Every structure is written in structure tokens, then in C-alpha cells.
Amino acid sequence: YQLTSGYKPAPMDLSFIKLTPSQEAMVDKLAENAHNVWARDRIR
């Protein structure tokens, strides 16, 4: 485990169950949604 600077998070393992390509498309869905709501509030 790496060197920390006040707090050391390592609860469990997370990359065991591999993400599906539908999850990789939903990653783009969430990112597109977030950036579009952002530019919906950041028109200028």
C-alpha cells in the first residue's frame, strides 16, 4: 500500500468483478450528462 499524508483508505478490493462494456457506455452516459448539465449552467 502506498505512502499517505494523514489518512489511508483501503477497505476492500474493487476491480475483481470486471466492468461490462455496457458499464463503459454508462460511464460516457454519466460523464456526458454531468458535462451537459455543467454547460447548461456554464453557458458563458
Side-chain angles (χ1 to χ4, degrees), residues 1-7 9-15 17-22 24-26 29-40 43-44:
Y1 186 72
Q2 296 179 357
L3 295 174
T4 60
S5 63
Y7 180 68
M12 287 300 291
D13 186 74
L14 280 75
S15 179
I17 298 168
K18 187 183 287 292
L19 299 178
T20 194
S22 65
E24 296 177 354
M26 289 177 68
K29 288 181 181 180
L30 292 173
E32 184 174 0
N33 192 1
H35 181 73
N36 284 324
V37 172
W38 178 65
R40 187 176 179 181
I43 302 167
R44 65 184 60 85

